[PDB]
Amino acid sequence: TAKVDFLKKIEKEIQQKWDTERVFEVNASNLEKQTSKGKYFVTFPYPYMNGRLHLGHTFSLSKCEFAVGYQRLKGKCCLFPFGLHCTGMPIKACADKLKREIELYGCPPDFPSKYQWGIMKSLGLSDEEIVKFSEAEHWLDYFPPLAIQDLKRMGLKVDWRRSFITTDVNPYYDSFVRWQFLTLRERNKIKFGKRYTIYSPKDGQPCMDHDRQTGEGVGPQEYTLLKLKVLEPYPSKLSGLKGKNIFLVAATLRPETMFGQTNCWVRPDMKYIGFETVNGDIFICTQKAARNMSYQGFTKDNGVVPVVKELMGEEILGASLSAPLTSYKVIYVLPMLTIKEDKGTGVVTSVPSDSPDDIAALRDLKKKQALRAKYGIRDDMVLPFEPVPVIEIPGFGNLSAVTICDELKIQSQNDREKLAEAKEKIYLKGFYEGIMLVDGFKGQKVQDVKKTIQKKMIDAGDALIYMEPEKQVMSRSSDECVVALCDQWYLDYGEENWKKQTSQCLKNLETFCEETRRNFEATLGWLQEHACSRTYGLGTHLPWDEQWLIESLSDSTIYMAFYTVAHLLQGGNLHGQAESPLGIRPQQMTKEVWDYVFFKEAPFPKTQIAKEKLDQLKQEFEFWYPVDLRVSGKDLVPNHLSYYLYNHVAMWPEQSDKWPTAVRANGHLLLNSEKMSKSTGNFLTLTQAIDKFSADGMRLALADAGDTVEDANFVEAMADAGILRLYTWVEWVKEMVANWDSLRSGPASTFNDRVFASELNAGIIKTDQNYEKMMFKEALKTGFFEFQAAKDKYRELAVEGMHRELVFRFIEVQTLLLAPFCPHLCEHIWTLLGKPDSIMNASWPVAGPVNEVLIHSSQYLMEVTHDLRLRLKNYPSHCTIYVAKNYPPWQHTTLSVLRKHFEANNGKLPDNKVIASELGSMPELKKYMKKVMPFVAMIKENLEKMGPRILDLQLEFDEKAVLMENIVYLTNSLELEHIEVKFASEAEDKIREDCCPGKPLNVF
């Protein structure tokens, strides 16, 4: 239980030595006279500053910590910088929950954990310090220094000096941002206009992906909205807007179908509003509908619902309606008991002919009289209205809905699953196949005339556009967002000649699997304009309409260029207030200066900055770009990373090269197979993990988390079997330096040594491939779990004791396979082996030629040892083992025949049917067609397990002799007395006939 502490200690001292010799500070002025193999540059999406760093953070970024640990050995020079996001809508939303909690309940509060106060005392804060966190700017004081201490404490390979904060509190970053956005307005990628977006009324601004708590992908979804005029007489409750004209307002998606209205659906129990539009009319719907319309300019005042009256639907029942389009000049409001209150307007269009719900429920009101009677509806309001043909889908004729409803045997509006199957297999056809019937459009496929039917209804004033968030959107601040129609500066991602270009960048980008790339391709063709113009929350100010601020997904996109110069500008002061190393004033970074630094061919600008500094920066940036690698969750694919090509494409539109190169999406970290939830008692800040399991102890489990795009897992129990094998290895290397002698002076020629060194070399290679494929689970598997396999194997098979020079080799090479993973343990180990330098300077271990047939021989060996420890738990002293020289007769036939079926079609043995068929057809297998089809099966098994080598008429290595090279170990672990190995020709009938090479038999 104190072995964990054995790890923590050497960590703290190794970290001390590291940043006092400043091992991780790289400069590009130094490393441009010496091209290693090039540069290596990785970034992590700088995280939000509304908290310590949690674990899911650390697993998403482990990925680049290991990339550079590895690529530094491989010899590249590493730049791993770290920025800190605050330009958020997160930091302020939190500060405001805390503000309104202090002011509702006191300091110390008193409530009727789950309140933000209780989360802030969960960080050990005195009372009067949690109070100072109410305006957002105490966060920018507090959390960034904590991220930098939490990162140096995990031991990451990071140039402090290039780090920074992101709101206008940091001047330099702000000047950078303004430069970007001047160039963007300049090149016609930022526009202004009245557009649609998701929008939070409490926020007073657009609510885009990173400002949300729910529905991070949703956007505006359109509807047609129909006006139904209520006709005199009004029902008993519409009485006092004696003046105005009164409208039922209903949401639909199939405007072409509106010819077949027979009525109108409301739910007797639902709460409906009536309110005064902009032109003095009374619209009737749900409060949520109205609020959505208000923000889209339906109301006199934006977002204010002038509520004229309130009521359940039950009072509306029986109102007469003039409806658009339908040749029923008078229809009625009827009760549909099952209306979802979320989507739409609480009023639905009854097209019995093409919605199944509708023909169902209309049947129901016709069917039994008490369904009318309870809602007091007259019969003239229901019975005289039969369904109506408008779409003729080919499969089904005029009346598609009622047709497919009578064949699924429907009887009420609640058979909801049968109904929904119907709506699938009718609606989707209706779009493509369907063909219109009504005059004018007599016979066009609806896919075409849908839009123009709709326009026709708008201009005769009968219908209006209505938007709605698709699935619901929560905001950070907890206000249920709506679409709004508003003034906005925005990014023009729907342009043709920009989407073209960035999707080219996508083709050239490297995603590490096919699915991550289909996500990019998905959102590219989906992405249109993106509203970046905000008005509340921390950040940076739009330099020409300064009431606007830049939202977080839009000032985040090309930030990595700055990462290359921060150390020469802020020098590492996070707020950049400390003077600049280069001496350059923030007030001196005008566009033309940035322009110079970044665009290769810009002109030196009329600036007071001596030419040498500007060259230092231009140089640095040009050395480190492009971005070699960005790492992240599967979540930033549909927003930040799409916007990240798009922007790089538009910034250096010319340099194909300055674009990003590669991008690797892991999933969301789980905890012990559990959604990692602060409420479920199932959670771990990094500050916390690093003291529970050592930082090496942690990183180890974080390699084994996952490399699927699919959500990876973190199991604490395995973090512990990890601290285990680490302390046994360190005690093991203590053990080997203490016994330099009871190892073997002289030549390492024994059979097992060749085997073990050819194995250690195959491990160095598999680990190299797994590191460069960035599969840190398998890089672990090969590089360590099996390195220890092959070490213990040669611990056991070497009865002669193990060879000194080979031991210290394995020590070094293991320790180097591990450095990217646990650099503190390895640093300790490497100074144990007394080497003079820091292990960060080591070259990747070189691999020696790999003896294949050897390793097959030792595999064969090990396998029959397993087999014979099995057959032994039964009943002895003597053993005798038999091994057949040639395959027996029936088997050299069945395997000269699987040789012929393998040789004739590039390796595809036909099915079980062609094989057993042509083996019953050879007479020499008649007594043995009971043993001729298990055998081929076992063959196909290993023909799928260790190569086609099992199809040779003769092995690659003397069986009998390989046996004989290791027999001592066998009698000693098997604890017998003597074992004969006869060549299976002197054995009995059963043994000489059922024994094949590769699977010997034996007796006691």
Ligand SMILES: CC(C)C[C@H](N)C(=O)NS(=O)(=O)OC[C@H]1O[C@@H](n2cnc3c(N)ncnc32)[C@H](O)[C@@H]1O
């Ligand atoms: C650049 C700007 C637009 C973004 C801003 N800096 C920001 O998003 N900060 S953050 O706090 O949510 O993102 C930090 C990183 O960590 C990854 N990640 C997050 N959660 C998890 C998780 N549960 N499991 C695994 N990985 C996670 C995530 O992909 C992201 O790259």
Ligand SMILES: CC(C)C[C@H](N)C(=O)O
């Ligand atoms: C009854 C419905 C099919 C009417 C409209 N097309 C909708 O989907 O809401």
